[PDB]
Amino acid sequence: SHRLTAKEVFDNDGKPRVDILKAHLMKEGRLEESVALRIITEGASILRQEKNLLDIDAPVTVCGDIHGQFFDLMKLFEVGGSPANTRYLFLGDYVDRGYFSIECVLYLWALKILYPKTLFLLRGNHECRHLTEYFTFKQECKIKYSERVYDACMDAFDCLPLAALMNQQFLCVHGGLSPEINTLDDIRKLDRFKEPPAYGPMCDILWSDPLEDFGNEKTQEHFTHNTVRGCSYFYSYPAVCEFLQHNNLLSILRAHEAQDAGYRMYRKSQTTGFPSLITIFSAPNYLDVYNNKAAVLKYENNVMNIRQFNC
Amino acid sequence: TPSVVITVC
Ligand SMILES: [Fe+3]
Ligand SMILES: [Zn+2]
């Protein structure tokens, strides 16, 4: 098949032609390797200038895991609104598990180039060397493009911001909290431009989970070692509420764990009566059985609107 | 405090 050229992908002003890209990428159509490198590195250079902790005003549509499922990413934008007039925040895990990981990366990076101030991308735990080597992304890059393209993606992933402060009310992360993250400044002071370490605050942001019995803890341990992930922690409901109160926040919005309906709202804060934690998951998943359903979160006009799709 | 609206399909 035809490999798209730079003139076919970019207009004379340097704007990516994302409708052309969308139609070609869903057929697993490839770009010229130099053009893919241009998309990845231009997007990376934009991400690199962003803060560890993004400042994102409402209105915004918040999205969880994609995992290379390009057809569901296309549906998500239909449900959530066109990026041409909709602000977006993605919470990571763009690659692995699904079949179209490099296509999702190239399309989202193109959208970031086109809408640098209204479409935002965070890092998930899969956006790293260790996991893309263990799953399929590293092999797919080498096959369809080259190791140079894989290396460029790894460097670009290093540039992904770690978190977002949304409407000065919500902390948004892929995974969750850390025993070493007690204030928002704790996130701001991190060096994110690296492979995520095996332990520590950057690891925990990307990897941690609420306890299985979140909201009905038998003990008082805020963070316990995470036996599902084999790294990082489970965080408790008192752990979350204490973080929220200390930092004058309403809730934590995160992704990272698939849910039956595409979302879950956990136990409400005893102070505000608002769910202390919300998980959003924005593409299908294969855990026990296949589950096509997914959801996005649209925060607008002081209404938290959870929109399910893919029924 | 915002309200929550769930839209299911
Ligand atoms: Fe994850
Ligand atoms: Zn995931």
For residue A28, give every residue at least 6 positions away whose Cβ sits within 8 Å of its Cβ, in sequence order, or none: A100, A103, A144
Distance, CA of A201 to chain centre: 17
Domain that holds residue A307: 1-311
> What's the distance, Cα to Cα, between the start and end of chain A in Å?
33
| Residue whose C-alpha is closest to residue A62's, from A156, A159, A153, A169 | A169
Min Cα separation B6/chain A (Å): 5
Interatomic CA distance for residues A252 and A257, integer angstroms: 14
Task: Identify the DSSP state of B5.
Answer: E
User: This structure's resolution (angstroms)?
Assistant: 1.8
CB A235, CB A276: distance < 8 Å: no
* Structure determined by: X-ray
Number of structural domains found in chain A: 1
Whose CA is closest to A305, among B9, B1, B6?
B6
Q: State whether A305 and B7 contact (CB < 8 Å).
A: yes
Distance CA A189, CA A186 (A): 6
Q: Which amino acid is at A94?
A: Y
Q: Name residue A117's amino acid.
A: K
Picking from B4, B8, B9, the nearest residue to A304 by CB comes out as B4
Q: Which single residue is written with the structure tokens 């809730």?
A: A251
Residue A74 contacts B, CB cutoff 8 Å = no
The answer to whether A40 and A153 are in contact (CB under 8 A) is yes
Cis peptide leading into A59, omega within 30 of 0?
yes
| Single-letter amino acid code for the residue at A41 | T
Sign of CA dihedral A56, A62, A66, A72: negative
Catalytic residues of A: 126
* Chain A residues lying within 8 Å of B8, measured CB to CB: 261, 308, 311
With tokens 């019995």, the residue in question is A213
SS (H, E, C) chain A: CCCECHHHHECCCCCECHHHHHHHHCCCCCECHHHHHHHHHHHHHHHHCCCCEEEECCCEEEECCCCCCHHHHHHHHHHHCCCCCCCEEECCCCCCCCCCHHHHHHHHHHHHHHCCCCEEECCCCCCCHHHHHHCCHHHHHHHHCCHHHHHHHHHHHHCCCCEEEECCCEEECCCCCCCCCCCHHHHHCCCCCCCCCCCCHHHHHHHCEECCCCCCCCCCCCEEECCCCCCCEEECHHHHHHHHHHCCCCEEEECCCCCCCCEEECCECCCCCCECEEEECCCCEECCCEECCEEEEEEECCEEEEEEECC
CA nearest A98: which of A64, A79, A70? A70
Distance CA(A257)–CA(A64), nearest Å, equals 9
CB pair distance less than 8 Å for B1 and A272: yes
Specify the long-range contacts of residues A257-262, CB closer than 8 Å, at least 24 apart: A257/A209, A257/A281, A258/A65, A258/A285, A258/A287, A258/A291, A260/A291, A260/A293, A261/A293, A261/A295, A261/A308, A261/B8, A262/A293, A262/A294, A262/A295, A262/A308, A262/A309, A262/A310
